[PDB]
Design a protein around this ligand. Structure first.
Ligand SMILES: Cc1ncccc1-c1cnc(NCc2c(F)ccc3c2CCO3)n2cnnc12
Ligand SMILES: [Cl-]
Ligand SMILES: [Cl-]
Ligand SMILES: [Cl-]
Lengths: 29, 350
């Protein structure tokens, strides 16, 4: 499906960004 | 729609001017308070969200130019110090880099021959800032070396004001749109662009002049396109027809990375319909996980759709002014809307 395959791409790519974010410790404002 | 929200608070900024932008800082780590910035008139204001719907004012930046009108802001971080940074721009066509801890401008960039409508930071490299302008061009800046990496425009660039642009999730390509009714793709993972980005780190610096996009279409909307965002390999964009159109370059089966610059087809997959949002300059937003889509209208209604469905309407009787932009917190627990009457509305997810 067009929807199921695109959702899977979003899931994999957002997980890559979330893992990059989890490794960072940006100071609070 | 399975998503429900409760309006827990609202306030009005004392300048009484329209608020055109709102952005939560998605770079803040877990455990730290949720913070958002609002932009409008010659002001940038930061707020912290707390329990029981509290919207805590932190501080404001007032530009020395009383006639500056900020239209957009974007968050990033300093890769060397891990401190947060906020970029702002508007009618003057000047990009200001603000230190949010002090709310002071630390540096600025000139170059655009007119107003800047949108700023966006690259999702992987925090130093790469994209600006889009009424001068018909997009510009990519490296804020670590204070260099202009590239100018996207010229022979086959936009022929009228650029209103919006977005990077894809991994930061390999940009889609831009504007007053010429077109949506254009610019690949930044090309060997030319990857080398230009590397040269900007080695660094007057000579910017790449990218005259030709990797795809262009005028067949999705028949009028100005004021907002575009990627939804994976698909695109969401809107004009004044009370609909956000979900589409993709090429035929149904065509892979986004195999599309040739001369590709003449587009595939329209569907539309998210709404009402009373046919004036220019109204932005839609998505949460981090791209599970929810939000858009405010001219009479203060906030539409939310569940993107995991191949519509919840948030209304408050005292919220009646145009909602220019909305922002979700990184964890999707809070949704903030900002309006033409300088009001800010906080909606908490149930
Ligand atoms: C001065 C002014 N008065 C009255 C109404 C609007 C404007 C205005 C606002 N915003 C922008 N640009 C930013 C921008 C955009 F480009 C596309 C969509 C979008 C926005 C903000 C919210 O949704 N303007 C550019 N020129 N006038 C403007
Ligand atoms: Cl942002
Ligand atoms: Cl070129
Ligand atoms: Cl349309």
């Amino acid at each position: 499906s067009m929807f199921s395959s695109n959702r899977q791409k979003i899931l994999e790519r957002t997980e890559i960004l979330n893992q990059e974010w989890k490794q960072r410790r940006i100071q609070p404002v | 729609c399975k998503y429900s929200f409760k309006c827990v608070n609202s306030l009005k900024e004392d300048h009484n001017q329209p608020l055109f932008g709102v952005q939560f800082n998605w770079h803040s780590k877990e455990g730290d308070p949720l913070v958002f910035a609002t932009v409008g008139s010659n002001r940038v204001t930061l707020y912290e969200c707390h329990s029981q719907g509290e919207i805590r004012l932190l501080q404001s930046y007032v530009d020395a130019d009383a006639d500056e009108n900020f239209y957009t802001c974007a968050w990033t971080y300093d890769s060397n110090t891990s401190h947060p940074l906020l970029a702002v721009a508007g009618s003057r066509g000047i990009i200001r880099i603000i230190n949010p801890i002090t709310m002071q401008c630390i540096k600025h960039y000139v170059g655009h021959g007119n107003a800047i409508n949108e700023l966006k930071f690259h999702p992987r490299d925090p130093n790469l800032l994209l600006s889009v302008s009424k001068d018909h061009a997009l510009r990519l800046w490296n804020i670590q070396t204070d260099t202009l990496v590239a100018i996207f425009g010229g022979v086959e660039g936009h022929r009228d004001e650029v209103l919006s642009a977005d990077y894809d999730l991994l930061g390999e390509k940009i889609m831009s749109c504007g007053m010429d009714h077109s949506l254009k793709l610019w690949r930044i993972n090309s060997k030319r662009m990857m080398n230009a980005i590397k040269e900007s780190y080695d660094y007057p610096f000579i910017s790449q002049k990218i005259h030709f996009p990797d795809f262009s279409t005028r067949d999705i909307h028949r009028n100005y396109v004021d907002c575009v965002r990627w939804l994976g390999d698909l695109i969401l964009s809107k004009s004044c027809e009370n609909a956000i159109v979900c589409w993709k370059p090429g035929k149904m089966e065509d892979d986004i990375d195999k599309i040739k610059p001369s590709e003449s087809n587009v595939t329209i997959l569907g539309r998210f319909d709404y009402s009373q949002c046919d004036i220019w300059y109204m932005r839609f937003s998505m949460d981090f996980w791209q599970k929810m889509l939000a858009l405010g209208n001219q009479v203060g209604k906030l539409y939310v759709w569940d993107l995991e469905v191949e519509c919840t309407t948030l209304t408050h009787h005292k919220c009646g002014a145009a909602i220019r932009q909305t922002s979700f917190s990184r964890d999707s627990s809070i949704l903030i809307a900002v309006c033409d009457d300088a009001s800010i509305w906080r909606w908490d997810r149930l």
